[PDB]
């Protein structure tokens, strides 16, 4: 099926710190596989997935040296941004970046990504053509003009269509069985009493992977639903629940449909009184 | 394999 790779980078400055903290996290198919943190006693990229543990020492050394260059890039950029926004002293500031590639089921490159944020808001992004930039405001227009004049997009396009795709292929080969591993939701419906002639029905979806899931309540297979946002269980799997307010004695007329990748077909659930 | 940013800063 389709695949992806992303690196999510963050640098945070603060008055009490002489140098910004830098964190880089790599993901393959939305699962963390590598991490670098400047706060560690010995900062280095480390494997975050066991299938990455077989990469030799030259790989770890090469990635770690790149992170040192990124820390400098982010440090200088943070200082420029403080100037662009004429920000006052005594504040903490955040520069973030996302980059990577999306691959189709037929292995073609669907899209390259490159985006930046300052203070948690879009700053500048590389357009889908991998040639032009979108600047979010007046300060980002200063950056856009700089990057157009220096030809920055060409460097980013070459990485996104080349090296990004090549390495994603290599990781997919190593993490083959592990990355294709899905966990089906184990589902059940709970009964909760209410005021008047009414009752709450809660459809629980547990132990599933990946996080993408759909829970749908229906009245005879065809009010606004209440739910919780998908949450991590702590073991690598996810949880979710969806609820409906129904009249007393009418519980069996309502069904909860669970849609997930790991299931051979959608689940159909109902309140089963013990 | 992580990206190293083109040397021009923001």
């Amino acid at each position, epitope marked *: 099926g389709p695949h992806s790779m992303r690196y999510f980078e963050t640098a945070v400055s603060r008055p009490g710190l002489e140098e910004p903290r830098y964190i880089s996290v790599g993901y393959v198919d939305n699962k963390e596989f590598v991490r670098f943190d400047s706060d560690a006693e010995n900062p280095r990229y480390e494997p975050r997935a066991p299938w990455m543990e077989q990469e030799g020492p030259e790989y770890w050394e090469r990635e770690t040296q790149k992170a040192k260059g990124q820390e*400098q890039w982010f440090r*200088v950029s943070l200082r420029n941004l403080l100037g662009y926004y004429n920000q006052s002293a005594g504040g903490s500031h955040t520069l973030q970046q996302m980059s990577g590639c999306d691959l189709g089921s037929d292995w073609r490159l669907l899209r390259g990504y490159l985006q930046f944020a300052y203070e948690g808001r879009d700053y500048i992004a590389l357009n889908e053509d991998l040639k032009t930039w979108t600047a979010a405001d007046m300060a980002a227009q200063i950056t856009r003009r700089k990057w157009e*004049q*220096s030809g920055a997009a060409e*460097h980013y396009k070459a990485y996104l269509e080349g090296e990004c795709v090549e390495w994603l292929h290599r990781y997919l080969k190593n993490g083959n069985a592990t990355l294709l591993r899905t966990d089906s939701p184990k589902a059940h419906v709970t009964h909760h009493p209410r005021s008047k002639g009414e009752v709450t029905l809660r459809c629980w979806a547990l132990g599933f992977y990946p996080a993408d899931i759909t829970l749908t309540w229906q009245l005879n297979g065809e009010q606004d639903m209440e739910l919780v946002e998908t949450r991590p269980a702590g073991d690598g799997t996810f949880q979710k629940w969806a609820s409906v307010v129904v009249p007393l004695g009418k519980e069996q007329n309502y069904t909860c449909r669970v849609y997930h990748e790991g299931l051979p077909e959608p689940l159909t659930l109902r309140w089963e009184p013990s | 394999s992580s990206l*190293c940013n*083109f040397r021009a800063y923001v």
Partner: T-cell receptor, first 111, second 109 residues
Framework: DMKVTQMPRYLIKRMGENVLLECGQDMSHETMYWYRQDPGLGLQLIYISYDVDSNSEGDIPKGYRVSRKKREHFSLILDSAKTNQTSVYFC?????????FGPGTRLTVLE | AKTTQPDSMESTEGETVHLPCSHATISGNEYIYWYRQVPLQGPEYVTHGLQQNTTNSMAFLAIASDRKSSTLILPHVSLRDAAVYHCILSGGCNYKLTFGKGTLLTVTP
């Protein structure tokens, strides 16, 4: 538009004396450089400055030190000049495309 | 360091000059830059490229398909073009340049 300034074009110093070479760049580029060039040879990097107080030794740092307190200026200091320090010194700056070079300072250190 | 150029090249004004440059060990994100240095003045940027052939007011840059060699082409050379031409690799994420001896181009009238 892009201009790196270096004065004087020429300087004579006695061996053992302090030397200070100054470089200016009004473009406020983050990156500045000091190179030296001996006759018939390519430029050799002495020090690079990535920003204010963010200096890194180049290929030949011995006998030199630098100062970058402001983005617009970059100083090269010879605490005790040696006759082998006779050379043409070029300062450069960059914003991330090419490097822009100053007109150079010819320094002759004599016994 | 990674680039190899002939030490000298002779040419006559009005002729097409091809300045070769060998860089077999070039990495994917290394740009090919050309700088020139007239008698004793500071070096000056001529052109640069990554994979594609580049045309600008000063010169034409031809980069081989495998990127292991390149050529700086100076059409109808003038006396003003006599200089040392430096072919240098510039990594896309860094600010350093390692100058070599380059090619001293003489232009006879």
């Amino acid at each position: 538009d892009m201009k790196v300034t270096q004065m004087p074009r020429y300087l004579i110093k006695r061996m053992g004396e302090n030397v200070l070479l100054e470089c200016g760049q009004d473009m406020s580029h983050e990156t500045m450089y000091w190179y030296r060039q001996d006759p018939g040879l390519g430029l050799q990097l002495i020090y690079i400055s990535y920003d204010v107080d963010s200096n890194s030794e180049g290929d030949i740092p011995k006998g030199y030190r630098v100062s970058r307190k402001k983005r617009e200026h970059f100083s090269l200091i010879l605490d005790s000049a040696k006759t082998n320090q006779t050379s043409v010194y070029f300062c450069a700056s960059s914003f991330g495309r090419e490097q822009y070079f100053g007109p150079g300072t010819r320094l002759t250190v004599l016994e | 360091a990674k680039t190899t150029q002939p030490d000298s090249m002779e040419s006559t004004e009005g002729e097409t000059v091809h300045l070769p440059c060998s860089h077999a060990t070039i990495s994917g994100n290394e740009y090919i830059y050309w700088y020139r240095q007239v008698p004793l003045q500071g070096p000056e940027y001529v052109t640069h490229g990554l994979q594609q052939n580049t045309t600008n007011s000063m010169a034409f840059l031809a980069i081989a398909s495998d990127r292991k060699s390149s050529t700086l082409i100076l059409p109808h050379v003038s006396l003003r073009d006599a200089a040392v031409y430096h072919c240098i690799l510039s990594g896309g994420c860094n600010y350093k340049l390692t100058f070599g001896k380059g090619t001293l181009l003489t232009v006879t009238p």
